[PDB]
Every structure is written in structure tokens, then in C-alpha cells.
Amino acid sequence: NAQLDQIKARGELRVSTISSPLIYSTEKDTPSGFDYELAKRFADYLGVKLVIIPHHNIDDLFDALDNDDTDLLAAGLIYNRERLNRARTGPAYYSVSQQLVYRLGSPRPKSFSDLKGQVVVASGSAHMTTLKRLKQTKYPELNWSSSVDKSGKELLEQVAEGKLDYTLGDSATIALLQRIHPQLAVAFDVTDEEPVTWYFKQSDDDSLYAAMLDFYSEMVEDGSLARLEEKYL
Ligand SMILES: [Cl-]
């Protein structure tokens, strides 16, 4: 049978995520996050239980999606053309800018020419693509690396604790973490707004994908998706 039939027979919609106040947070009894809330409503729409699996590594998320270990990715993921070989994006929900973060009390960098330490980002993130682009063009001196086991949220926490000098994160996540870690500061903006979307496996089977688009249509219809977006942004 088709993808949706299998989901219905499992009685569960398997969604892979990353822990963050914007995506999926369990810092108290009731979980929260935009991706979590939208995924719950989607599971309800399909008539199945939601099964969330938070990961740390984006490359792993895409491998799971390709291996049918999960049904969709809902993890604050920025559009990345390299992911289209095996995956397809759902509709765009909101946009975020990429910002370079440093810790208050330490020197404020003025540009990528002025960094003292390394900038570390999450492996497979769109943040990584941006750094590669800049190093091959305007900043040959740029010292950067990728973290295989830390998320953008965990990387921001490291900057806050003084264990990492800088990270390149998204504007929405930075804003939320700042209310818990006021020592996090923006040195400068790096990119203009980029859209966030869910990802699904590319297949000739649209039993799930078409349902996702039907669900999205219903959500937009009375301005309900806008309200939800604005609540977390
Ligand atoms: Cl990303």
C-alpha cells in the first residue's frame, strides 16, 4: 500500500525534529514549539497519534527520511537545494535571517574579517552552506567547522556559557534563547530572510504529500496558520 495507508496501519505519524523553543520544546509538562503544534494538528487531521523523535544532526534527519524511519522532517529547516535529490519541501511557513552571535563581555566582531576564534555551526545546516559560500568568495581567512552532535540551539547555549566564541544561527531561535540567555548578542546579520519548510521523501506516491497540502489549505483558510506563526515569531 501507499505511504498514507502505512501511516494509518501504524496508527502513528512519525515526525523527526530537533529540540528548540521554536521547533519542539519539553522544558515543562506541555510540549511547545511551532513545528510541534503544527505536527500535532496534522496528526489529528490524519487521525493518527503523533510520534516525535528529536535528533541533533540534520544529515541524520535526511537519512532517516530517506530510509523510511520517519514520515516527515519538521525541524526549522531552511531551504537547501542539495536536499532535493531525495527530498521535497512542503509549503514555506515563515522566514528567518541568519545572524552571527557572540557573548556579551567578549569582543564584538565587526565582520567575518574580525573573528578571533572559530565559528561552529550544526552539520548539514543551511548555516554551513552560507559559511562555505563566504569562505570561497569574500572571506578566505574564515575559520569555521561543523558540529556533528550539537544542534543550533545547543551551539547557542555553548556561546552563552563561554565554550564557543561564535555561531551562525537563525533570527527566530536567537530571539527566543535570548530571553533565557541575555548574554547572547547579535554581532551582525549575515543573510536576508530565507524560508523554512517541512521535508518529505521524494516519491511517486502523494498519498501523504497531497494530504499535507490539503491540511495546509484548511489551516490557511480562516487565518489559523498566520496566528500560529505569529505566536512563535
Ligand atoms: Cl537548516
mmCIF file of N, CA, C and O in Angstrom, residues 81-131:
data_model
loop_
_atom_site.group_PDB
_atom_site.id
_atom_site.type_symbol
_atom_site.label_atom_id
_atom_site.label_comp_id
_atom_site.label_asym_id
_atom_site.label_seq_id
_atom_site.Cartn_x
_atom_site.Cartn_y
_atom_site.Cartn_z
ATOM 1 N N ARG A 81 18.897 23.577 -1.575
ATOM 2 C CA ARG A 81 18.801 22.918 -2.886
ATOM 3 C C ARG A 81 19.464 21.518 -2.922
ATOM 4 O O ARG A 81 18.976 20.644 -3.619
ATOM 5 N N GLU A 82 20.520 21.292 -2.127
ATOM 6 C CA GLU A 82 21.174 19.971 -2.094
ATOM 7 C C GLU A 82 20.305 18.855 -1.544
ATOM 8 O O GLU A 82 20.565 17.686 -1.817
ATOM 9 N N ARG A 83 19.288 19.207 -0.764
ATOM 10 C CA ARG A 83 18.396 18.222 -0.182
ATOM 11 C C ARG A 83 17.327 17.707 -1.164
ATOM 12 O O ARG A 83 16.627 16.727 -0.867
ATOM 13 N N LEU A 84 17.221 18.336 -2.332
ATOM 14 C CA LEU A 84 16.188 17.979 -3.297
ATOM 15 C C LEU A 84 16.420 16.727 -4.103
ATOM 16 O O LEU A 84 15.518 16.290 -4.809
ATOM 17 N N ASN A 85 17.618 16.157 -4.000
ATOM 18 C CA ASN A 85 17.904 14.919 -4.677
ATOM 19 C C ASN A 85 16.977 13.814 -4.182
ATOM 20 O O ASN A 85 16.325 13.133 -4.990
ATOM 21 N N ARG A 86 16.825 13.717 -2.857
ATOM 22 C CA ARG A 86 16.000 12.667 -2.258
ATOM 23 C C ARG A 86 14.754 13.172 -1.548
ATOM 24 O O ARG A 86 13.875 12.366 -1.209
ATOM 25 N N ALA A 87 14.628 14.482 -1.365
ATOM 26 C CA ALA A 87 13.525 15.058 -0.620
ATOM 27 C C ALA A 87 12.798 16.203 -1.365
ATOM 28 O O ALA A 87 13.248 16.703 -2.396
ATOM 29 N N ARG A 88 11.643 16.562 -0.846
ATOM 30 C CA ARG A 88 10.843 17.633 -1.409
ATOM 31 C C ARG A 88 10.357 18.470 -0.257
ATOM 32 O O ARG A 88 10.134 17.992 0.867
ATOM 33 N N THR A 89 10.246 19.748 -0.501
ATOM 34 C CA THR A 89 9.825 20.659 0.534
ATOM 35 C C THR A 89 8.322 20.795 0.581
ATOM 36 O O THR A 89 7.653 20.718 -0.458
ATOM 37 N N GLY A 90 7.758 20.964 1.775
ATOM 38 C CA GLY A 90 6.339 21.327 1.849
ATOM 39 C C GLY A 90 6.249 22.834 1.654
ATOM 40 O O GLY A 90 7.248 23.505 1.350
ATOM 41 N N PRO A 91 5.075 23.414 1.888
ATOM 42 C CA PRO A 91 4.941 24.859 1.757
ATOM 43 C C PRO A 91 5.851 25.649 2.714
ATOM 44 O O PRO A 91 6.245 25.136 3.742
ATOM 45 N N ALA A 92 6.194 26.888 2.383
ATOM 46 C CA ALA A 92 7.036 27.706 3.303
ATOM 47 C C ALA A 92 6.193 28.266 4.440
ATOM 48 O O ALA A 92 5.140 28.805 4.170
ATOM 49 N N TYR A 93 6.618 28.146 5.700
ATOM 50 C CA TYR A 93 5.820 28.697 6.795
ATOM 51 C C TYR A 93 6.162 30.114 7.234
ATOM 52 O O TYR A 93 5.285 30.907 7.555
ATOM 53 N N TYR A 94 7.423 30.405 7.333
ATOM 54 C CA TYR A 94 7.853 31.706 7.807
ATOM 55 C C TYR A 94 9.278 31.857 7.334
ATOM 56 O O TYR A 94 9.843 30.906 6.803
ATOM 57 N N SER A 95 9.829 33.057 7.464
ATOM 58 C CA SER A 95 11.198 33.284 7.058
ATOM 59 C C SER A 95 12.045 33.785 8.216
ATOM 60 O O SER A 95 11.544 34.448 9.111
ATOM 61 N N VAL A 96 13.325 33.445 8.168
ATOM 62 C CA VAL A 96 14.287 33.856 9.182
ATOM 63 C C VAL A 96 15.554 34.380 8.515
ATOM 64 O O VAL A 96 15.884 34.004 7.370
ATOM 65 N N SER A 97 16.228 35.301 9.186
ATOM 66 C CA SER A 97 17.531 35.776 8.710
ATOM 67 C C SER A 97 18.608 35.004 9.489
ATOM 68 O O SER A 97 18.324 34.447 10.542
ATOM 69 N N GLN A 98 19.810 34.896 8.926
ATOM 70 C CA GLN A 98 20.939 34.233 9.576
ATOM 71 C C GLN A 98 21.749 35.334 10.271
ATOM 72 O O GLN A 98 22.048 36.361 9.646
ATOM 73 N N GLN A 99 22.053 35.142 11.557
ATOM 74 C CA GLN A 99 22.826 36.130 12.351
ATOM 75 C C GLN A 99 24.045 35.513 13.046
ATOM 76 O O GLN A 99 24.001 34.379 13.488
ATOM 77 N N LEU A 100 25.111 36.283 13.163
ATOM 78 C CA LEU A 100 26.328 35.818 13.852
ATOM 79 C C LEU A 100 26.203 36.254 15.299
ATOM 80 O O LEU A 100 26.063 37.451 15.593
ATOM 81 N N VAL A 101 26.316 35.295 16.202
ATOM 82 C CA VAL A 101 26.163 35.541 17.625
ATOM 83 C C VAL A 101 27.515 35.458 18.356
ATOM 84 O O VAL A 101 28.407 34.691 17.973
ATOM 85 N N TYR A 102 27.683 36.306 19.359
ATOM 86 C CA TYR A 102 28.870 36.293 20.218
ATOM 87 C C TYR A 102 28.319 36.463 21.628
ATOM 88 O O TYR A 102 27.129 36.678 21.795
ATOM 89 N N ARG A 103 29.182 36.379 22.633
ATOM 90 C CA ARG A 103 28.779 36.501 24.029
ATOM 91 C C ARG A 103 29.135 37.898 24.577
ATOM 92 O O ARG A 103 30.266 38.328 24.426
ATOM 93 N N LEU A 104 28.173 38.589 25.207
ATOM 94 C CA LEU A 104 28.438 39.910 25.821
ATOM 95 C C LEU A 104 29.571 39.761 26.822
ATOM 96 O O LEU A 104 29.607 38.776 27.570
ATOM 97 N N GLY A 105 30.493 40.722 26.822
ATOM 98 C CA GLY A 105 31.669 40.671 27.697
ATOM 99 C C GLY A 105 32.914 40.293 26.909
ATOM 100 O O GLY A 105 34.027 40.626 27.305
ATOM 101 N N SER A 106 32.723 39.572 25.806
ATOM 102 C CA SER A 106 33.818 39.205 24.911
ATOM 103 C C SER A 106 33.813 40.214 23.761
ATOM 104 O O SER A 106 32.808 40.893 23.546
ATOM 105 N N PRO A 107 34.926 40.307 23.005
ATOM 106 C CA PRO A 107 34.966 41.279 21.898
ATOM 107 C C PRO A 107 33.877 41.076 20.821
ATOM 108 O O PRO A 107 33.629 39.945 20.341
ATOM 109 N N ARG A 108 33.231 42.179 20.471
ATOM 110 C CA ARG A 108 32.189 42.178 19.462
ATOM 111 C C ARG A 108 32.826 42.210 18.077
ATOM 112 O O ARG A 108 33.458 43.205 17.717
ATOM 113 N N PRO A 109 32.676 41.129 17.297
ATOM 114 C CA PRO A 109 33.257 41.189 15.966
ATOM 115 C C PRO A 109 32.471 42.137 15.063
ATOM 116 O O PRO A 109 31.261 42.215 15.171
ATOM 117 N N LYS A 110 33.171 42.834 14.176
ATOM 118 C CA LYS A 110 32.551 43.785 13.264
ATOM 119 C C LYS A 110 32.172 43.135 11.917
ATOM 120 O O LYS A 110 31.267 43.599 11.224
ATOM 121 N N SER A 111 32.888 42.079 11.549
ATOM 122 C CA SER A 111 32.620 41.356 10.307
ATOM 123 C C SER A 111 33.309 40.000 10.416
ATOM 124 O O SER A 111 33.910 39.700 11.450
ATOM 125 N N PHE A 112 33.262 39.207 9.349
ATOM 126 C CA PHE A 112 33.954 37.923 9.340
ATOM 127 C C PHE A 112 35.483 38.069 9.230
ATOM 128 O O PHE A 112 36.200 37.072 9.359
ATOM 129 N N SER A 113 35.974 39.290 8.993
ATOM 130 C CA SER A 113 37.424 39.534 8.947
ATOM 131 C C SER A 113 37.995 39.662 10.344
ATOM 132 O O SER A 113 39.192 39.485 10.548
ATOM 133 N N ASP A 114 37.117 39.960 11.293
ATOM 134 C CA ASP A 114 37.471 40.304 12.656
ATOM 135 C C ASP A 114 37.257 39.209 13.711
ATOM 136 O O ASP A 114 37.345 39.490 14.895
ATOM 137 N N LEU A 115 37.016 37.960 13.301
ATOM 138 C CA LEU A 115 36.796 36.898 14.281
ATOM 139 C C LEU A 115 38.098 36.453 14.944
ATOM 140 O O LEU A 115 39.126 36.378 14.274
ATOM 141 N N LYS A 116 38.049 36.156 16.242
ATOM 142 C CA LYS A 116 39.241 35.675 16.937
ATOM 143 C C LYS A 116 39.252 34.134 16.850
ATOM 144 O O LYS A 116 40.197 33.509 16.342
ATOM 145 N N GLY A 117 38.163 33.546 17.306
ATOM 146 C CA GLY A 117 38.006 32.095 17.351
ATOM 147 C C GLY A 117 37.226 31.524 16.192
ATOM 148 O O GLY A 117 36.858 32.208 15.270
ATOM 149 N N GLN A 118 36.949 30.231 16.257
ATOM 150 C CA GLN A 118 36.219 29.591 15.183
ATOM 151 C C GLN A 118 34.717 29.771 15.359
ATOM 152 O O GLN A 118 34.201 29.914 16.486
ATOM 153 N N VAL A 119 34.036 29.828 14.229
ATOM 154 C CA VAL A 119 32.580 29.854 14.217
ATOM 155 C C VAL A 119 32.185 28.409 13.942
ATOM 156 O O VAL A 119 32.645 27.800 12.973
ATOM 157 N N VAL A 120 31.372 27.836 14.824
ATOM 158 C CA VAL A 120 30.932 26.459 14.667
ATOM 159 C C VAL A 120 29.411 26.467 14.420
ATOM 160 O O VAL A 120 28.684 27.170 15.109
ATOM 161 N N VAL A 121 28.954 25.690 13.443
ATOM 162 C CA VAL A 121 27.521 25.565 13.131
ATOM 163 C C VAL A 121 27.153 24.098 13.130
ATOM 164 O O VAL A 121 28.026 23.233 13.143
ATOM 165 N N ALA A 122 25.867 23.802 13.081
ATOM 166 C CA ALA A 122 25.419 22.398 13.053
ATOM 167 C C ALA A 122 25.687 21.767 11.693
ATOM 168 O O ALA A 122 25.485 22.421 10.656
ATOM 169 N N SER A 123 26.188 20.526 11.682
ATOM 170 C CA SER A 123 26.449 19.803 10.425
ATOM 171 C C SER A 123 25.155 19.699 9.566
ATOM 172 O O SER A 123 24.082 19.421 10.082
ATOM 173 N N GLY A 124 25.300 19.902 8.259
ATOM 174 C CA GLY A 124 24.174 19.807 7.321
ATOM 175 C C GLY A 124 23.166 20.969 7.303
ATOM 176 O O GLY A 124 22.164 20.913 6.576
ATOM 177 N N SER A 125 23.382 21.974 8.146
ATOM 178 C CA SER A 125 22.507 23.097 8.201
ATOM 179 C C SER A 125 22.748 24.006 7.026
ATOM 180 O O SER A 125 23.798 23.951 6.406
ATOM 181 N N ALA A 126 21.744 24.802 6.701
ATOM 182 C CA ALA A 126 21.884 25.854 5.695
ATOM 183 C C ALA A 126 22.938 26.864 6.177
ATOM 184 O O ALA A 126 23.588 27.507 5.369
ATOM 185 N N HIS A 127 23.126 26.971 7.492
ATOM 186 C CA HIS A 127 24.190 27.844 8.034
ATOM 187 C C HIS A 127 25.577 27.430 7.494
ATOM 188 O O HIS A 127 26.429 28.269 7.207
ATOM 189 N N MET A 128 25.768 26.123 7.337
ATOM 190 C CA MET A 128 27.023 25.560 6.841
ATOM 191 C C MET A 128 27.246 25.953 5.415
ATOM 192 O O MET A 128 28.373 26.286 5.019
ATOM 193 N N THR A 129 26.186 25.897 4.612
ATOM 194 C CA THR A 129 26.282 26.298 3.203
ATOM 195 C C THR A 129 26.685 27.762 3.090
ATOM 196 O O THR A 129 27.482 28.126 2.243
ATOM 197 N N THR A 130 26.099 28.606 3.928
ATOM 198 C CA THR A 130 26.426 30.016 3.924
ATOM 199 C C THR A 130 27.905 30.251 4.241
ATOM 200 O O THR A 130 28.565 31.083 3.600
ATOM 201 N N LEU A 131 28.427 29.565 5.247
ATOM 202 C CA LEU A 131 29.839 29.764 5.599
ATOM 203 C C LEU A 131 30.778 29.311 4.444
ATOM 204 O O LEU A 131 31.736 30.002 4.127
#
